[PDB]
Design a protein around this ligand. Sequence first.
Ligand SMILES: [Ca+2]
Ligand SMILES: [Ca+2]
Ligand SMILES: [Ca+2]
Ligand SMILES: [Ca+2]
Ligand SMILES: [Ca+2]
Ligand SMILES: [Ca+2]
Ligand SMILES: [Ca+2]
Ligand SMILES: [Ca+2]
Length: 615
Amino acid sequence: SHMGIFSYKDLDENASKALFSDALAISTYAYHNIDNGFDEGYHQTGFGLGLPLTLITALIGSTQSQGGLPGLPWNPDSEQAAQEAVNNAGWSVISATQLGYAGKTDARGTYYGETAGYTTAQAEVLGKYDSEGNLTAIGISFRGTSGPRESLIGDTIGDVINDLLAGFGPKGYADGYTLKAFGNLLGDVAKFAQAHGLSGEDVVVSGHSLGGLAVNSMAAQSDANWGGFYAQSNYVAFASPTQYEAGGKVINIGYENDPVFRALDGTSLTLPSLGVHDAPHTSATNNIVNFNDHYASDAWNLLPFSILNIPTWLSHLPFFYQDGLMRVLNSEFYSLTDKDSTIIVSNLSNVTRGNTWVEDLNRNAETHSGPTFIIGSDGNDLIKGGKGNDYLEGRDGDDIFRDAGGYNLIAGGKGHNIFDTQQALKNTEVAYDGNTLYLRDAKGGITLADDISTLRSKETSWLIFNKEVDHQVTAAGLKSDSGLKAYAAATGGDGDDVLQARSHDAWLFGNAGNDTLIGHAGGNLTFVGGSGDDILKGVGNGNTFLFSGDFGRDQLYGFNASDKLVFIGTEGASGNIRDYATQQNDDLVLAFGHSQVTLIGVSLDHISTDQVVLA
Ligand SMILES: [Ca+2]
Ligand SMILES: [Ca+2]
Ligand SMILES: [Ca+2]
Ligand SMILES: [Ca+2]
Ligand SMILES: [Ca+2]
Ligand SMILES: [Ca+2]
Ligand SMILES: [Ca+2]
Ligand SMILES: [Ca+2]
């Protein structure tokens, strides 16, 4: 059973999604929009010849963004923007007075580290309230490296000393950070929580980079300190160099090409710490790619990947975490993902998005495996899937998709979207159920694609060896300069349809409703019952029975040794059909949670491996 890439402990899927959303919001808030100008600059001028301009904007912003420097009257107030965002997510700062806290805070309510050597640490304490004003949850967020704009340089230097001691300092240092920085504050928050009827489980703890380290540190101290109040608190760490994994308290989320993420092994410095360190960790999402201008560039990657290579730090910036990971969370394919799913997140500048394909380069990382998910932007994307199984999501904007093989799901989203086969149309079998385009390649790989307006092929002749040809996708067939080409299919509607294959039908599409799909003597037919509970009557040899998503409860007659079952984007993580199977007398039931198919008069030992695809 898939629980989502951000699944946490034994929470149900909706609860862990809500926890993740809260964590990322408060983690982001701790930076007070310090990287607002970098965000604008990067998207406007990029990371290549325009990099000098990007850096200027990072420092002093514009009329539309605020860079690192405070006090420029033509910048917008990015700190107010940051407050609005965290308040919108349901969270508001709790004052030192409410907590009865005697330590240091600033005019924005931020809490400061308590011990000498830790006085540049920053934390935020926030509350979530019900519609009647009662406190229902508490959020604790630790800031990564940096500080308030007004003391940015001095504060950053103290942070850097803390960072260096975590890597090269005494054993125990990382573990000690949060206790030394915020030991007293955390005691007061616990008493305040208790006073309001809350327990440790009502607390979310988050933070990014050095803040992610602080999350792991707090978890590491939580069994013994503060009366054990926070032992069962919810720890969500972003871009942490460290992992605390004893007791399974922390989820460590980050991008594999972020050189800070997992830089330390537990808390230990190792040789990979100064190079590529992609050995998988049990608490971590090990295979999410930040597909940005640096990752995309062969020229940038002539330099060795290392935390000592400053350009590689592009992938670490908080705005990439906020924007990119919320798109993962909100993906149409989220319920199909697991902790270690390969996910490629489009994070290109406006300079490169129009000429660079988002694809799994597998750069500076262990070899990827399993299905690949590629998440587009709300802009116009170019997205390319590989030879294995792919889930491609365009979102808003006019997107163009390519894919090199296997079994695939494509969601074009809003906009005018195009699927580009890169070869002669005659090499692809094409059909349409009225909403979804079905494409089968010469090796039998099948793609389902939603919201595709145009199918693009590449044609040739003795005269012009390359010509792109666009085919408008319509209910009546593909329309191009040559005319209208009908689909070789029978297509039902929302009702309970009876569909009988005609001599040249290659597909039967029941669509919604409980349909009856009847084959023919020549076989070689693909049955797609669609949603609802369908009856599939196989006749002859070489038939394919196809099932995707929530496909209802089907009954399958006439299955034999020459037929094939294809499951794409269905419930369950296993790639072995035996795991789904139960014999009920003479019938074989294959169960996919809320969906299932019963093969009438079939036994499991009569089905060979190559008769089933689980994609
Ligand atoms: Ca700081
Ligand atoms: Ca990896
Ligand atoms: Ca898009
Ligand atoms: Ca593919
Ligand atoms: Ca789109
Ligand atoms: Ca129907
Ligand atoms: Ca149906
Ligand atoms: Ca069905």
